[PDB]
Amino acid sequence: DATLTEKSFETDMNLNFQNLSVMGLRILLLKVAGFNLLMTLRLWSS
Structure with missing residues (x-):
């Protein structure tokens, strides 16, 4: 719950x-x- 940071x-x-x-x-x-990284990282750390 925040804007990440400044x-x-x-x-x-x-x-x-x-x-x-x-x-x-x-x-x-x-x-x-949106259609690759987020998919891989979803299973692979970072």
Whole structure:
């Protein structure tokens, strides 16, 4: 029950290339993990 933690830097700040950087990285991570990593790790530690 919490927001994991803080950092004050790990944001998106969409605007130019940075947008595709944070967005593209998060979108891919979920596209590669949502159906692969999350499946493997589910049985394999970490």
